Ligand binder design. Structure first.
Ligand SMILES: CNC(=O)c1ccc(-c2ccc(F)c(C(=O)Nc3c[nH]nc3C(=O)N[C@H]3CC[C@@H](N)CC3)c2F)cc1
Length: 284
């Protein structure tokens, strides 16, 4: 790419770096706006990101600009905290349920929007769910169809079993995993290898078979030698979540992508009958 087109940005600080790339806080030297800068060119990707520029929703971190100068910079609306840090800060008391429920409701709204345009996130985790002082939560760093050890903790089972053409249901799984983690203050399935991840899922939800998941035994990475564990009861998995919450979570964690609840159906679940939008206690 050419030169000088990032001149208009002053790096304020490195936020972090990982498999995604590098993320900075920066100020536009001419408009004064404070933004997040992601540093990473294919055309398969250039038109994929351009689609995301048009994918605007109050629960999606706005993509402001895309700048190619051996580097691709994406410019994002800046947010002051992520859900992981807020979870850790909240660990002694827990996030109050009404806040958990608001955050879950909002992310399902954002996902419902993305999914209605057939856009998948693919890599939801607490670290890319961004929050502000007003009680909003937003989806960040959408994963591309092509594209510091990647975590598997939120990866859906069909991905782990070798599905090549997976669906929006993978985001519902990831979010159910995050929901459970907000409630219990412990990761649900903290696998440290692909098989440890699969087997942690199997040990809680039961080893899947053709009864609960038609087609599972023909999946590319399925092996008949998989151990057969019995399912645990949910009341043991996420206490003290109430029965509405457990019901919704059970549907977000169905093995069969065709049974897993959609984002739109989840919004209608009775768990949200009393949803509100509380203010978080954020110390910045
Ligand atoms: C262990 N780490 C991870 O797994 C992980 C870590 C970062 C990412 C990631 C990758 C590419 C991105 F474009 C974005 C992104 O869009 N970021 C933002 C957009 N607007 N504001 C921000 C922002 O980062 N704000 C900070 C949040 C809390 C800080 N305390 C202070 C400000 C992103 F967040 C993905 C995974």
């Amino acid at each position: 790419g050419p030169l000088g087109s990032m001149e208009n940005f002053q790096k304020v600080e490195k936020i972090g770096e990982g498999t995604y790339g590098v993320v900075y806080k920066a100020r536009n030297k001419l408009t004064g706006e404070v933004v997040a800068l992601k540093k990473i060119v294919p055309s398969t990707a250039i038109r994929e990101i351009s689609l995301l520029k048009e994918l605007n929703h109050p629960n999606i971190v706005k993509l402001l600009d895309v700048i190619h100068t051996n580097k691709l910079y994406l410019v994002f609306e800046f947010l002051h905290q992520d859900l992981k840090k807020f979870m850790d800060a909240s660990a002694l008391t827990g996030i109050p349920l009404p806040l958990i429920k608001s955050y879950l409701f909002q992310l399902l709204q954002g996902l419902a929007f993305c999914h209605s345009h057939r856009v998948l996130h693919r890599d939801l985790k607490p670290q890319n769910l961004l929050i502000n002082t007003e009680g909003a939560i937003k989806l960040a760093d959408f994963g591309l169809a092509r594209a510091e050890v990647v975590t598997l903790w939120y990866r859906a089972p069909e991905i782990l079993l070798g599905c090549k053409y997976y669906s929006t249901a993978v985001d519902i799984w990831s979010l159910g995993c995050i929901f459970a983690e907000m409630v219990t203050r412990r990761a649900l399935f903290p696998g440290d290898s692909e098989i440890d991840q699969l087997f942690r899922i199997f040990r809680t939800l039961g080893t899947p078979d053709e009864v609960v998941w038609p087609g599972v035994t023909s999946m590319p990475d399925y092996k008949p030698s998989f151990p057969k564990w019995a399912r645990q009861d949910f009341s043991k998995v996420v206490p003290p979540l109430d029965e509405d919450g457990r019901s919704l979570l059970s549907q977000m964690l169905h093995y069969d992508p065709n049974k897993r609840i959609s984002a739109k159906a989840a919004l209608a679940h009775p768990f949200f009958q009393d949803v509100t939008k509380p203010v978080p206690h954020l110390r910045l």
